[PDB]
Design a protein around this nucleic acid. Sequence first.
RNA 1: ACUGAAACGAUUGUUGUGCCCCUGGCGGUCGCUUUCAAUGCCU
Length: 85
Amino acid sequence: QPIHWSYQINTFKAAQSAYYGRSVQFGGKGATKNYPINYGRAKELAVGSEFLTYIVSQKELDLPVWIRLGKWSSKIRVEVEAIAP
RNA sequence: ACUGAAACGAUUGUUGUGCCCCUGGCGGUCGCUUUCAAUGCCU
């Protein structure tokens, strides 16, 4: 559940590793296969955000206080409390 | 296969080109090197 959230729209690119770069149309010659050629804009969930989840288990659980999520393996602080009986 | 695996908004570019701290201006004005003195004493 999102408790507090914001979005950033940030561009991402393909690198020109060679000294010479041609902008090629996607599906053109030398570009005929589905790969991230050219550029795109990602609407990311931003640092200014907080989400709430619940884990239910039948045994005391050594939950990691850091996790990674998504397309770019991005860090989340997990702060966790066991809800007492 | 975490709505997954990899993922450069990049490449190039001179805040540039011209420009007299310039013009005018008397270190000027006033001012006695002055005041006193035996070529002297004797033949």
